[PDB]
Structures are given as C-alpha cells and as structure tokens.
Design a protein around this nucleic acid. Structure first.
Lengths: 125, 206, 145, 119
RNA sequence: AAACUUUCAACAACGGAUCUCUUGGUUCUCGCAUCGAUGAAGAACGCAGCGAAAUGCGAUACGUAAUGUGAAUUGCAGAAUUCCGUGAAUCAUCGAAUCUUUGAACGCACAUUGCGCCCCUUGGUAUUCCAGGGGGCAUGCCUGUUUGAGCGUCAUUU
RNA sequence: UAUCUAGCGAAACCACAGCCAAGGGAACGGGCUUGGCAGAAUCAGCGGGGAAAGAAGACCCUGUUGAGCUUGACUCUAGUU
RNA sequence: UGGAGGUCAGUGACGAAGCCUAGACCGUAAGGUCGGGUCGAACGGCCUCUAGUGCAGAUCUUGGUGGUAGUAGCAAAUAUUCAAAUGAGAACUUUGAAGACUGAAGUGGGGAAAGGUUCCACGUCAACAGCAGUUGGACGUGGGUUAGUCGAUCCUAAGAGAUGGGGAAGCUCCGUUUCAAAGGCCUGAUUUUAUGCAGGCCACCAUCGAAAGGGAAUCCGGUUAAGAUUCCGGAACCUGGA
RNA sequence: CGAAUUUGGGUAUAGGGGCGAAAGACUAAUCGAACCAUCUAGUAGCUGGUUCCUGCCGAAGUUUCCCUCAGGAUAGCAGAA
RNA sequence: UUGACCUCAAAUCAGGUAGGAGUACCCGCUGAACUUAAGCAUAUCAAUAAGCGGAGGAAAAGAAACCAACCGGGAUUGCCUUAGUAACGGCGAGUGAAGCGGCAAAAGCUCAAAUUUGAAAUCUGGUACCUUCGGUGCCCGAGUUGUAAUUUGGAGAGGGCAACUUUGGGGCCGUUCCUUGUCUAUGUUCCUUGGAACAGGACGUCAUAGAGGGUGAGAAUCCCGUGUGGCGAGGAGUGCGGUUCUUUGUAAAGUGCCUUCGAAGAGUCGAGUUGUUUGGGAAUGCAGCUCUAAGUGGGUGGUAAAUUCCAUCUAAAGCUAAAUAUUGGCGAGAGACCGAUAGCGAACAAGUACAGUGAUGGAAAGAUGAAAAGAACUUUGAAAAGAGAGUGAAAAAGUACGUGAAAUUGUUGAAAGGGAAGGGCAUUUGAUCAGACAUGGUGUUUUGUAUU
C-alpha cells in the first residue's frame, strides 16, 4: 500500500489527472515496453514511445502484427502504426489506434536524447 | 446549508387554480412560475437537511472496551469459534498458535509467506486472495471498490521488519500486544479471530 | 405546552445557534498539529528543554488552600536568594514574576531550593566554546516535578 | 521557419530596424496573398517573426536604459521591482532590523543562552 | 357473425423511467499568506489558415522572450531535410517583455470614440496656422526646493 | 357564418360514467332497493338536467389573523413652546 | 430499499443489474424463488450496523401522455379571373391580358423614436409564413452605408453638477457664487536667455444639458445589385492660415 | 373641435413618498400604500396530506381550571412494561 | 534702503502616500422587524438581519489603576468546568456571566515627566563615490516651543568605597522546508470462452512495491505509478563547528555596601442627570450635557450614606509572536455523503440561453460503439427517404444512437357486448400449465445380466 501523504488513492482524482494530463505527461503515460531481445540488449523494460520506432502488436485482434508507428496521438491516448489500418468499404485506409501498453517495441529510433535517456535509466547499449 | 433556498420564490396564493406552494416567478425561462421551497418540489431542499453536528462518535466505558477485548482474546483461544468465523484453521496443530523470535525479527515478505506456510495460515492467505471481489454498491466510486476477507492477525512484542513483511502479505494484519484492537480481534462483531502469537507476545499478554 | 410530571428545563435555543455551532471534528488534527509544533520547537531549540522553570505556589482560595501547583514565575526575592539576576534567569530559562510577593517562609524555601536544584541540574554552554552537546531533556516540568 | 532570438541579439540595431521593416513588407504582401487564396500559415510565421524582432528591440532598449540608470537611486518605475504593492510599502530589511541603542545594549549584555539539562 | 373497450407465448410506436457508469457537487481535515495609482477586480472591442461559443491573449493579440523536457499538433490543410538537434509541441515551467478602449481611472468631459493646454521632432517657402510621431498636464495629504502675501511682527533713520 | 369537402388544427372540463318513476338515504340519485324497461354505429340542432364550467364565497360567523381610515381609546413621537 | 463491518475462498461476458411475460412454486401478507424473451457489467444470501428507507391522493413538484377531437374554428379591412413560363408538384411564384381598390389628413413619396441588416444579389424550402409555396422580412453564402457645405460636434433654456465651504458615524447631503489669495493674450526686448523681461487691460467668475430651440458654408445633371445635397462632371460658397 | 385645446422631445417630483380641476384616482397590465432582494423555511388554537404486512389489546366526546367556547392542562377511559 | 522670524499661500517644483477590489474569519458604528409571551405595549427575537467605515494572515486583547480575602494568586487568548449557576426578568415568557481549579501556549516590555550644558552629541534631503534592502564624505535644511544617550515604578538617578565577569563584522561547507527534476521489482509463458482476456484453468516471479488509475471485461507482475532508497539544479535564510581578514582597550552591561533623592500622563479621575446597554440589581459599560479635583493622592473591594481601619493595584500614553479564529483566496488528503428531477443554480459553449426599463430573476441540457469501422454499391422515388446490401460481437447500437418502463397508440390474434365497465362466492365451457407410475421391490426365459 501507499505510505506517503502526497499521493492520493482517489479514483476520481486519478481519472481527472489521467484525462486532463498535458502532452508531456501524456507521453510519459503512453510509455511502452520493449521486447525480450531489446531488453537483453540494453537493460530497460519500458520507454516512452516515439514516432519512428518499430512496434509489434502482441495483444488484441491484431496480435503478433509488426509495424512502425505513423503518429503518436497523445490526444487520443494511443499510437497509429502503418500497415495496421481498417478498410472503409468505399475502399479507404483509415488508421487504427493501438495502445502502447498493448504493443511491444522491437527497434529503437535512437537520437542522442534517447541515448542519454537509456544511460540515465541504466542501459548498456 | 443554502441548497434549495437560492431562489426568491413566493406563493401565488389561492384564486389561480394552482397549489399554494411557493413558485419561482419572473418570466421567459421555464423556471418561472415553478414550485420551490419544499421536499416535494424538484430543486427544493430536502426534508430535515443533514447536519454536521449529528452524533458521529459514541462514547464507551473503558471497562466495557477492555471486557470486549478480553472476551475477543478468549474467543480467539476457543477453537470452535475460529472455525465458525471461517478462518481455515482445520490444519493448525492447535490453537492458540505461538511462533518465536525468528518470526518476530523476520525481514522479507518472501520468508514471511514461507513462515506462514510453515505454521498454517497460508490457507487463510489463499482465502483472502480468492475472496477479493468487487463491491455491490456506490462504494466502488466512493473509494471502497474491492472487498475481501480478513486473514490472520500476527501479534508481536517488538518490531523488526515483521510489520513490513506481513504488511505487504495480503489479508494478514499485524498488532502489538500493547494495543490489541478489538476492531480486528473480532471483525464484524464476530468472535474467534485467527491470531498468531509470538512467545514474547504471550509473556506480554501475561 | 406544559405536560405531565417532568422537570422544568431551561434550554437557551431561541437564537441562531445553528449559525453559531462549533463542532470539534478537528480534535485529532489539532492534537497532531500540537505534537508536530512541539517537535519542531524542540528541534529549533535543540539543546533547550522546551519549557521554563516554574515555581511552587499555593492556590488562592479556601477551597484549594490545601493544594499546591505551578506558579507563573519566580519572585525577584527568590532570584536574589538563589544568587543571580532577573535578566540572567530569564536568559537561562527561569520564569521570573515581578508582581508576586513572598510572605510565606515555606514557599520561599521551596522555590529557593527549586532554583538551586535547577542551577545544579543545568549546564550553560559558553558563547564561544566547543559546544558540548548535552542530550536535551524535553520537559523541565517533568525534570522537577 | 522563423527568425531566432539569439541571432537577433547578435545583429545590431540598424539591422534590427531593417529586418522589422522587411518583415512588415512581407506581412503586407502575404496578407494580400491570404485575401486572394484560401489558407496559408506563413502569415502566422511572419507575425511570429515580427513579434520576435520587436521583443528583441524592446529588451535591448530596456537594457540600455537600465545600464544608464545603473548605480543610482530613483530608477524609472518600469525598471524597479514589481513584487507587490504591500511588499513595496513594507519596511526594508534594514529598517525592520533597526533597533534602539537601549535594546541593542540589552541584547548584547543578555542574549538567549544555550543551556541544557542532563545532570 | 362486420366496424367500435380488455390481455398478449407479439411486434411496431410515443416517451424517457429503471439499471449500470461519473474529469461533477457536498461535507471533514491539513498546509500557506499573495490584489491595486509600478494602475487592481470588473467591463467593452478585437486577435486563429479555416471560430460562432467556450479557452487563452492584446495591433508583439489562441501569443513574443527565457528555462526544462524531448519529436510533435492533428478536425482538414500547412513549413516534416528544423528530428544525433541552441530543437516540434493547443507541452510544462515562468523570472524578461507587450498589454488596444476603459474601469478606483487621473488634462476637461463622456447617451460625444467630443474638446483643450505644455515640451520636443518632422512636413507644409511658419514661435503663433494645420498635420504627423513621441513625452506630459487629476485631487486630498507628508517632507523638502523655489517664488511669494500679511504695520502678524523683530533688527529700528535716507 | 353555421353546413359538406381539401389542407390545418387547439382549448375548457374529466373519481367512474351517463335512460327513467318512486322509496329510503347527509331530508332533491347516474349508481343503492322496488318497478318501468332495454338493440350496433351515428349527423344537424337544442338549451331541461349533469345540484355543468370559471374562483380555497367577496354576503354572515369564528380566529385571542390583518390592513385603510377616525377619535374624547392605551402608550408614545417629529415639530413647536 | 439505499449504504457499512464480517462470512458464504457466494453469483457473473458459457451472461450481473434492469425491464417484459392472463407461465410455475412458496408465504394469510408485506413479498420471495424459478421458467421464457430483451440486455451487456456488475450483483446477491446469512449475522449485524446505519438511514435522505416503502405513496393513491396533499386544487402535491417536475416531465410525459390522453378523451374531448380530425372537434371549436382558420367568416372584419368590397375581389378576383384567363393564358403562358418556371417547376416533381402552382388558387398563392413571375410575365402578359382583364377586373378592381387605396382616391393626395392615400394602401403614394420620405423622415423622428425604436429596430439592427431586416437593404441587395446568388443558391435555396428541413423548420417558420396557424392552407400552400417553386415565393419571403425564412435558411446558406457574400455585397452594400464614401461629406469642409446634411447632422452630431459649438451655445444656452428647464434643469443637472464638481470646486471653496459647511453638515453627516458614514455611505454621502447642501450649495453653483456664495464669508476663496479663484486670472489668461498682443505691436511684443528683435541672435548665448525668454508666454522669467525694461510693457498693457479686465472680472463671464467649472462643466454638462436640445440629431425639433440658436447655428459659417452646395446646387444641378449623371451614375449602382445596394450609397449619394456624401461618388463622378460642371458650377459655387464658408472657416482657418499664408 | 381655436381653446382651462391636442401632442413629441428634454427636464423635476420616488413609496407612508410623489402627484391628484379629488375618482382613494394615477405612480410601467401591480395601488385603501408600487416593484425588487433579504430578514424568511415569518407565525397560524385553521384547512389539506401524512407512504409495508400480519397478530394481540383497544377508546373518548365526560370532571375541574383557563379572554376558556374550532384550543389546552387536569382527572377519567386505553396500551405497554 | 536691506536681512530675518511667525502664520498662510502658489508651482505640470523634487520625492512619496490615500482611494478601489475584497465579507469566510477580525475591529468598530448604526440598527429592525417577523417571532415568543398562546392577546400585547416592557421584555424576547437581539446588543442579531440589513446599512456604513477600517486590517491582517490571522485580527483583537495583552503585560494589572487585575483577581481576590486565601498559607493568597500574578500579561493576554482558547478549551473543560464553574453553570443553565450568582443574578436580571409584566420575577411571566425568558435571559444569564465572572473568580478559583485542570489544560494548550507561554514574552517580555518602552515613551512623557531629568541640565549634555565642557560643546544637538539627533535626523530628512541634494550632491560625490562605494562592497547599493545600505555605507562614507561634504553642503543645505529640520530642530533649542527639544532631535540623541541615560530611567519606566518590577524600578531608577546622583554621589563615597568593593574581590569581579562578558567581543566585532559582511559571503560558504550540511542544516524544517520552498521551486523542483531524475533513477531503482517481478509473465503479458500455455490451454478454454470471448470481438477484445483484464475471465476461468496450469506453471511461475517480485514484494519495506497486493494503494490508485489506464489499457478492447474483475490486471501486483502490460503501462503510469505505489514501497524503500539514492542523486542534480534554482531560494527565502542562524539550525552553528570551521571559514578568506585588521586587534573594537578605558568600552558597553550586570553586580556588593551605604547617603540624598526618586519627577510618573487633567475638561482627566470623580460626581449629578439623560439615553442606550449589561447578569450587574439606589444604576455593568458606553456616550451627550453640567460641575470639576488631589498627592502617600487616586481607582477597586458587586447594597445607597456618614465615620474608623484594612487589602490590592497605579488610570487618564505606547509596542509585542504562540496557543484561538477559518462557508473567502491558493495547494493537498479523505468520507458508512449525493448520484443527472439527486448533489452547488450550473457534471454539458452555467450565472450561460432567456425575461424585465430597472433593481433583479434564471433554466433545461450526461451515455453509439473497443475502434466510425458513421452504412461503399444496386434499385424505386423530384427529394426526403425506402428496399436490398455493407461495417460491426450486436444495426433488438444508425445523428431522432447504452438498456428503453408506464401513461397513451397502430397492427399478429382470442373472447365479450339490448341505457356502463370493473368485483366476491360457485361451477361450466374454451385456452394454458405444474405435480405424479425409470419411484430403494420380484435373483435369474426376453435385454443396453465392472453398468444391476
């Protein structure tokens, strides 16, 4: 159980914070976990998702489906990945939103900020 | 205190073929000419509004409290009442169950669960774990979402990590012999709590 | 309005008492805050004992003539008999009462002995010394019951 | 893209004025284009650039007058602290700490002693 | 045994009850002290590539500056070589600015977007007239500066 | 105009409803008792009845409910002397 | 019945709550349990605790819905008709042809207050125009109001109202010239000065108050989807300055 | 129907006050004291309503006093322990 | 002729300050009535509502002209108690404190009245610098009708002797905490249902972490977080051991005997009336008017007045944290609270739409689905729409969307019908339905005799 007096166990307060979190807090919320090989390589379990990473959907109707994120809809609290779409019967492709907690990352789009983030978290590269 | 009274309603009286209840007036709203100031009216105050100076805490005689605590302790000793309360004590070699300074000075929750398995409260752990269920009311959004049974109460004399280990252990509560609350010595006013004592706890009970 | 055999009651509730109701829901919170403030003051005056030394004083009236309790401060005559000054005693934490008078030899002797015991029981650290921490006690009243 | 404040600070005052006038000219031309065209955000970009240039000019002028008034009391009211009306009316630290000679001598002679009770 | 009331192993209507839910209220407790002539609170106009409302902001107008994070915003477009970076963001923080007309509201007035005076600069072959840009001009009190008035009153003669 | 059509389309009122005679009954029944009788669905009028509708009778009485006004009622008061 | 402490390691997405059901069982009853449909996420029995806990009425509150009832009625202002066009559709729109009326204290042409875009064009009929609508003061998108001469602005009337000053505990009241020390323009000395200057006079003794009172000055012709004494062309005038 | 006329605009008079060629008239459909908010959920011996079942027991409209007579206290009748 | 002083002016003179907002609390002024008294006028409501002026984070009060009558206590404030008491009250209705006692918090003090008189030693302002919440120098000015030091009754001052004791500064290393930032555990392994596993079933792992929330259903282990711990920045700032550095040297304070003194607040105390107020009653406080003091005097000592004592303080001047307050502002944690006619009026473009000239009044209004995947396409129709399709787990989720009650309607259909219908007892007829004969029975001709 919680021990600090600065953390609330209120369902309404938690839902308010979740639904009204800003863009950066939302990025932290849509943090996603890495794959087994990625974790063995680096030493990190989860990371905030990025646009150009590679993700393997491992839960839902599209379980075991590989792709690369097309956008990070923080407003919609999800990520949109290419090759994972729906075919509108007029013959159109509409992106399908998938939760980063339900996906897994199989490749990291590494810039120097991400490398520093891995170093801070305790990775080894 | 001002709910239902934030209106300037005034009764129309008789001669207008309506009940004499006060009516918010004015015009052009739909609220105009509408009943107010009454428990029977929509938007009015309730009958006998709830007040903060109601009695919430009730005084109790100290001797009555101590009598109840002693009766709860003796009911814990009584083996049939523990089964009646449903504390999975069909495997305990005998009640009361006494453990020693190893459990008193235990430090990790893994070895806490191991000691509980050795003594026989692991069945109570499973009872609580499989009894955790959703509530059947408005407490779910009033911060009482889940309900579960009560596990064993480990009572000690000195704190050396036992409290933390059995604190993360589900269901199990911990107590000092000095306090020995009736609130868990007889949860739900039902006697026969499953209590795990230590040797120092027994001597301190003496 | 009046009825069968009952005591005549005088309930003074013909004003807006409902506006003037104070319910002490904050009993536990006030106790916690008082303990926290005591701890904070003790930390702020870490070597000092959180309390001034009060004298032994006889209760005024004939109902409490038998009992003795704590006064406000030591008389100037008591301070002189102890052998120091009022300002010095105030600095070292002896409560000093200017308006009290000493007309009882028993109370005079008891308060002088209290002052002597306090002086032997305290250690005034020098201004520019080594600062020999002395394991503060938290109640002069408890130290000199 | 939009001009950046660091190179705006590097450039001089005549360059800043010329850049501002060219930005206004480009704003006018782009606004005629907006009148003639459905939608375009280059107008917002140009407005942002104009705001950047104007704030750089303002900050450099305020720094110049601040260095002019440096070291002397009676600074312009736009340069002194904006903390709070009550705080500004309130006594300064020196004024609050000021004590009389009598109280100073009393405090010097009889400070609060650091006594303790052990034995 | 036609048309015209009652009840459905029955549907379809009208209507929005019940059930389930809740970024909302209501009470309790704890911590803190912070509005304004350095122009507040409140108004009125306006500001977005597509906004009417709401949010935010003030002609630097859904924002500028600085710092932190790090790659978005997204309803549709738009500059993705800014994406290994002095750097996206309807992000967070927030210390520099901007802050239209008002408003205690302050040049005089105000059912006027009315009417003045002073200083500087520029133009009209101009100290006076007109126009443009910039800076000002309220009252009641306190300390000080200067200029004064009073046979109120001292030093008491060309 | 009413009337019949096409289109449009309310409201008052409504315990349930709607045939009488007598009886008794809160002493003037649509219902109760006794008898007369009694056959779908209806249209235009009509003003006997529904003690028809409109309004918690305004006449009268009660209330230890008012208010307007008056005075030689009780108690005060501005002003004035 | 809504919540709370225990227990049933109770029921449940293989279907909880809820709702419907001249289907069943149990209890004298309050009601409980089950069968069948709909439904998709929570809920119940037992021992206790607790209360904003049970509706047929209160000319009860809010909301919804009936009979009346396709009924009363859509009857003042003399009045409409023929053809064509457009349109899915015309008693209602447009055009033409008739017949009429207002009959110059108009059903005409402008204005004040008020309204605020209702003006105009192009699309356009879901709602409104108590019938209809292809039309509209409706809906959607845009366009439109141009002044030295017309008004405001200036003056003061009835009156309002700061200042000096006096009341009032005070919000504020009186008072408008009264018991106030109430004050701005000319040839101007002509060159570092300066409405400080060798100079001069007074006496309304704030301000607001009229788009009908007073008042400086513009007319004609043409022009637009809409503006014109405002635009254009011509011909003038007044004020201020030089 | 040439005037004690009719009328627009601007003004002044504000609630126990105004205004009234006088009707208790008018004072924003409100006038024998406007309207708005609050005190205020004003008071009411007086009307109206007062929500589940079953079981057992089960009345009074009478005494005395009361500005008491539509109400109370009191005794009586009734229940429970 | 020229300088002053006093008083009063004027400046768009130099520099400042006040207004207004805000009411939850605080300090006052003003101030009702409804109501109760079963009527009503004193009374009560109430020293309240409304109105007015003024602050702060608290305000106010506050270190006795106190309480007491005791073996005395010892600033103020608050709580428990005193106590529904003493007392006030058409002595009716009603109202109604204070001392003591226990506790929380504790903080003490400083001006006037003193000749510095061997030196106005004091202070604002303008200049010039500096280490700028200020310091130093110089010069105007204020001020002798009094600015410093010295004293505040608890005392204290001036003199004659007495063994003594205590230092001064502006920046850091860690210090309640403020703004905060970052890192640190463990499955998404396998089968079933499902659209989706977050459900069920096996195997696990972590746990000072099984609080909470989100993810396509009830998730410790999927994510954020939670627990314990590290670390990094920007501060108000004494919680002091050491700090880069000259010696403040007769220099301030305390103290022991004596001697002389010992200034102490005036239209104020007090008194008489009037009004209000109080429990204060021959008058508790406040205020108006009249009179008007004194120096061991003056005030109080709850019965008015002499007279004699005693006790206790020292007014008419002033400052001060804490304990206390808290329907306002900012931040945070919760509940046996309410759950869209409830809860604030407002869960939503709510003080919004709308009404009134105005003061002011003031609503209604939440839910598709996991995801719009929001119905491509064909056909009828002028069109709206329909039919067929299609998406979806579901279209019995299609803007009028979670479920979709009742009133009130149209239609599968069933029965009834001479100026009502409905109901009870009892059968009949039609429709429909539960209960009950494999039940714990024969020992062997039927069998599907460890199943009987």
């Amino acid at each position: 159980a919680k021990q600090s007096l600065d953390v609330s166990s209120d369902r309404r307060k938690a839902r308010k914070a979740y639904f009204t979190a800003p863009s950066s807090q939302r990025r932290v919320l849509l943090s996603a976990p890495l794959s087994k090989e990625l974790r063995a390589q680096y030493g990190i379990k989860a990371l905030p998702i990025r646009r150009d990473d590679e993700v393997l959907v491992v839960r839902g109707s599209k379980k075991g489906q590989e792709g690369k994120i097309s956008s990070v809809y923080r407003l919609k609290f999800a990520v949109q990945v290419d090759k994972v779409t729906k075919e509108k019967v007029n013959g159109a492709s509409v992106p399908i939103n998938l939760h980063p907690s339900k996906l897994v990352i199989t490749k990291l789009h590494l810039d120097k900020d991400r490398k520093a983030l891995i170093q801070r978290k305790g990775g080894k590269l | 205190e001002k709910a239902g009274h934030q209106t300037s309603a005034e009764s129309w009286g008789t001669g207008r073929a309506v009940a004499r209840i006060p009516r918010v007036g004015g015009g052009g709203t739909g609220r105009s000419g509408q009943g107010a100031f009454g428990n029977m009216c929509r938007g009015g105050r309730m009958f006998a509004p709830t007040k903060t100076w109601r009695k919430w805490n009730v005084k109790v005689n100290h001797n009555e409290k101590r009598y109840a605590t002693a009766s709860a302790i003796a009911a814990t000793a009584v083996a049939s009442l523990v089964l009646a309360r449903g504390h999975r004590v069909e495997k305990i070699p005998e009640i009361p169950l006494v453990v020693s300074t190893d459990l008193e000075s235990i430090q990790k929750t893994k070895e806490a669960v191991a000691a509980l398995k050795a003594v026989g409260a692991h069945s109570d752990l499973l009872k609580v774990l499989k009894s955790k269920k959703l509530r059947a009311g408005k407490g779910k959004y009033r911060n009482r979402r889940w309900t579960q049974r009560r596990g064993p109460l480990v009572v000690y004399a000195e704190d050396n990590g036992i409290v933390k280990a059995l604190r993360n252990v589900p269901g199990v509560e911990t107590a000092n012999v000095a306090s020995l609350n009736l609130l868990q010595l007889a949860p739900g006013a039902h006697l026969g709590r499953f209590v795990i004592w230590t040797e120092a706890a027994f001597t301190k009970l003496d | 309005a009046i009825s069968k055999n009952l005591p005549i009651l005088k309930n003074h509730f013909r004003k807006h008492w409902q506006e003037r109701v104070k319910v002490h829901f904050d009993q536990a919170g006030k106790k916690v805050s008082r303990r926290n403030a005591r701890a904070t003051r003790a930390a702020k005056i870490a070597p000092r004992p959180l309390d001034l030394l009060r004298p032994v004083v006889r209760a005024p009236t004939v109902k409490y003539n038998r009992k003795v309790r704590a006064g406000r401060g030591f008389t100037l005559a008591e301070v002189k008999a102890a052998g120091l000054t009022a300002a010095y005693a105030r600095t070292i934490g002896i409560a000093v009462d200017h308006r009290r008078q000493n007309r009882n030899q028993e109370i005079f002797d008891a308060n002088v002995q209290r002052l002597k015991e306090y002086q032997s029981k305290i250690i005034v650290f020098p201004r520019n010394g080594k600062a020999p921490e002395a394991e503060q006690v938290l109640s002069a009243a408890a130290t000199f019951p | 893209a939009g001009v950046k404040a660091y190179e705006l600070r590097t450039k001089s005052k005549e360059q800043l004025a010329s850049q501002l006038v060219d930005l206004k000219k480009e704003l006018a031309e782009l606004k005629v284009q907006k009148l003639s065209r459905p939608s375009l955000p280059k107008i917002k970009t140009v407005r942002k650039s104009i705001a950047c240039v104007l704030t750089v000019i303002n900050e450099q002028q305020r720094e110049a007058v601040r260095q002019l008034y440096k070291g002397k009391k009676y600074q312009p009211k736009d340069l002194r602290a904006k903390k709070t009306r009550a705080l500004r009316r309130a006594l300064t630290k020196f004024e609050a700490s000021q004590v009389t000679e009598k109280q100073r001598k009393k405090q010097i002679a009889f400070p609060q002693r650091k006594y303790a009770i052990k034995a």
